């Protein structure tokens, strides 16, 4: 226990040291990025020790080390949950971040604020680890909002660009809408269970859990970009490519799913909540995969790939398979981060070109990025025995054989076919055919930082799923008896997706000119959701602010009904009193009227 708890905390403290060194104590600015990258790699080693101890004997513990605050009967302590979910996620996050940080040392080499960039990446990682190891809701909320704010600063990295500032604020807007659900759950859990600690919530185990769980579902919707609060994630491509790699794999986006996984003891008894998450995930995975089919920006295709894969995780929550949802988070982190890294390699070689229509003919020019891109695409599409197969295929079988919404099941299978199509689209247009890029050839992927960082994620993208699946302890009874057509559905629809994708891709070479359909326009413009919602809602809110709240009310009627009218009455009254003619005759005449009135009317003489 002493080694387990000591080493788990040292991992987190190790990550904070490069941040503390920004106080210019013992700093070597020459190579701060190397220093930060070295800290991550050493933290990965230290985190494998408690992870190994958990795998051996299932050792789990909670560290409530610092009493922060007691509010009457609610005691808040800095508490860390070193359990199954935190033991397996932390090494994966650190391993992936290690590659991303090493890659960023090449990708961001010419950025004058590279030191600040690596500090923000490190702060990003710290707030995620706070999120993942939190044992109470207030601590979790610190990490919850921390990753959101770090997303804002990294999406808007190139702050002179209006589109970057717009995308950064859009992430804040959508995530804060999800945060309404988060505070709802906190309020419900305090009022009804008198706690924010996971232990007491699970022990009391409320049966009337609709309200808190809908709040958590809303929080996950925003954070994991499920349908309704989804547009911000593809918009986050404004950030530098290393931001997207980290944002889409080991940090921001999986937090929503992780929040629902942490509360599976409640959701597993709530079929109403299961139905909602099942259908929310199904429409998300289908809709965003459909959007990816026609995107031309490489970073946007992969961004929509993440939204589709997140929706699948949300479907896995819906069918009450939280540990399968968690496994997909871990496997997805490897090949999704690689795919962004490979795309960054292509973008860099083509002088910041991100349109696949201007790529082509790179299969031999960039052999290593090609290999990684092909491996990553095969892992994403569930090629057997690669890292993605050990989660997705189990998820599809579990969904196929579950008691579940039939429509949600069909939408999920179609989205699996669409995954093959849009992965084929990247490979076909980026790597095959003839070059379509400019004439001055500057292709070069021979930097050891680029090669080594992608290499490590390539190895993970092959073996990580096999290694993880063979070491985690069983917590369910996996369904292994089913008809042949329910066992192979994932493989078949994926293969049909590849074949159909090849027909579409090759037809673009025929000397025939085609007009666009409504389906094509609907896919390209993302179902018009950003176009309608991002114009209408801001217009309505911003118009209400100036026209009615500010001018109509605060500069007019609240002025009129009091200070403006009161002043008029006094000014009019003053002119009545003072506009006298100065005549002795008129004043003494009023004296007579006063004396008479005093008696006849008021009887002051009595």
């Amino acid at each position: 226990m002493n080694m387990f708890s000591s080493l788990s905390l040292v991992t987190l403290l190790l990550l904070t040291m490069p941040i503390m060194m920004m106080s210019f104590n013992t700093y070597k600015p020459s190579n701060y990025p190397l220093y930060v990258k070295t800290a991550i790699s050493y933290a990965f080693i230290t985190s494998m020790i408690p992870t190994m101890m958990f795998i051996h004997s299932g050792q789990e513990l909670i560290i409530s080390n610092w009493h922060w605050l007691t509010i009457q009967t609610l005691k808040l302590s800095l508490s860390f949950k070193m359990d199954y979910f935190s033991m397996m996620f932390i090494p994966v996050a650190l391993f992936v971040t290690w590659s991303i940080m090493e890659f960023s040392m090449w990708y961001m080499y010419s950025d004058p604020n590279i030191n600040k960039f690596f500090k923000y990446l490190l702060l990003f990682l710290i707030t995620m680890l706070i999120l993942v190891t939190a044992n109470n809701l207030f601590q979790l909320f610190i990490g919850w909002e921390g990753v959101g704010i770090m997303s804002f600063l990294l999406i808007g990295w190139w702050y002179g660009r209006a589109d970057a500032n717009t995308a950064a604020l859009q992430a804040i807007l959508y995530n804060r809408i999800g945060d309404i659900g988060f505070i709802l759950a906190m309020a419900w859990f305090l009022t009804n269970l008198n706690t924010w600690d996971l232990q007491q919530i699970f022990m009391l185990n409320p049966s009337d859990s609709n309200m808190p769980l809908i709040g958590l579902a809303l929080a996950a919707t925003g954070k994991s970009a499920q349908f309704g609060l989804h547009p911000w994630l593809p918009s986050a491509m404004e950030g530098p490519t290393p931001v997207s790699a980290l944002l889409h794999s080991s940090t921001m986006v999986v937090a929503g799913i992780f929040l629902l996984i942490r509360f599976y003891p409640l959701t597993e008894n709530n079929k109403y909540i299961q139905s909602i998450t099942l259908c929310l995930g199904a429409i998300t995975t289908l809709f965003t995969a459909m959007c990816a089919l026609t995107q031309n920006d490489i970073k946007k295709i992969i961004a929509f790939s993440t939204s589709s894969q997140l929706g699948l995780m949300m479907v896995t929550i819906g069918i009450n398979q939280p540990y399968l949802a968690f496994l997909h988070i871990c496997t997805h982190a490897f090949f999704k981060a690689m795919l962004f890294m490979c795309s960054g390699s292509i973008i860099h070689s083509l002088n910041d070109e991100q349109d696949i229509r201007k790529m082509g003919g790179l299969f031999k020019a960039m052999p290593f990025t090609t290999t990684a891109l092909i491996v990553g695409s095969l892992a994403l599409t569930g090629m057997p025995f690669l890292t993605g197969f050990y989660s997705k295929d189990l998820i599809i079988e579990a969904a196929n054989t579950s008691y579940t919404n039939a429509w949600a099941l069909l939408m999920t299978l179609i989205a699996t076919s669409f995954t093959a199509i849009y992965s084929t689209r990247i490979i076909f247009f980026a790597l095959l055919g003839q070059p379509r890029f400019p004439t001055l050839v500057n292709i070069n992927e021979n930097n050891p930082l680029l090669i080594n960082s992608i290499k490590r994620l390539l190895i993970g993208s092959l073996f990580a799923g096999y290694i993880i699946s063979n070491n985690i302890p069983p917590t369910t009874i996996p369904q292994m008896t089913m008809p042949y057509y329910l066992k192979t559905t994932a493989l078949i629809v994926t293969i049909l997706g590849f074949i159909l994708a090849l027909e579409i891709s090759n037809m673009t070479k025929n000397l025939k000119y085609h007009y666009p359909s409504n389906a094509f326009k609907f896919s390209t413009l993302l179902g018009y959701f950003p176009t309608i919602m991002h114009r209408l809602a801001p217009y309505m809110n911003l118009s209400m602010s100036q026209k009615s709240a500010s001018s109509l009310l605060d500069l007019i009627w609240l002025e009129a009904i009091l200070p403006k009218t009161i002043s008029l009455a006094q000014m009019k009254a003053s002119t009545l009193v003072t506009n006298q003619k100065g005549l002795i005759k008129l004043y003494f005449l009023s004296f007579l009227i006063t004396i008479l009135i005093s008696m006849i009317l008021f009887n002051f003489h009595e």
């Binding site: 226990m1 002493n2 708890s5 000591s6 080493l7 905390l9 040292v10 403290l13 190790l14 040291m17 070295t38 800290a39 050493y42 230290t46 004997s57 299932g58 050792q59 789990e60 513990l61 909670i62 560290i63 409530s64 080390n65």
Partner: protein, 103 residues
């Protein structure tokens, strides 16, 4: 629809000045005038000492002598016990399961 002769003359004059300005951005040789495997292991040796060993000493001292001296601050899940296990604390032997029906 090309430059007028006056447009051409102005562009030529600004072009001469702009190129002169850009050349004047080059640093002279002395600028900036500044005011006054064995290695690889050692680099990684000093880092491990200062960023792993020293922090773990502090954390272990803090956990052992301050946190674990208070109730319920570190709570372990109790170890799983299986049929046929022996207990260290007592020496108790957990009996085996029944004989399985053949399968």
């Amino acid at each position: 629809s090309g430059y007028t002769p006056e447009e051409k003359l102005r562009l030529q004059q600004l072009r001469e000045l702009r190129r002169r300005w850009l050349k004047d951005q080059e640093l002279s040789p002395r600028e900036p005038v500044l005011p006054p495997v064995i290695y690889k292991t050692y680099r990684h040796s000093i880092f491990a000492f200062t960023h792993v060993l020293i922090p773990v000493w502090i954390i272990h001292y803090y956990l052992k002598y301050h946190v674990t001296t208070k109730p319920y601050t570190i709570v372990e899940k109790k170890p799983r016990i299986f049929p046929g296990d022996t207990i260290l604390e007592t020496g108790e032997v957990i009996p085996p399961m029944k004989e399985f029906p053949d399968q």
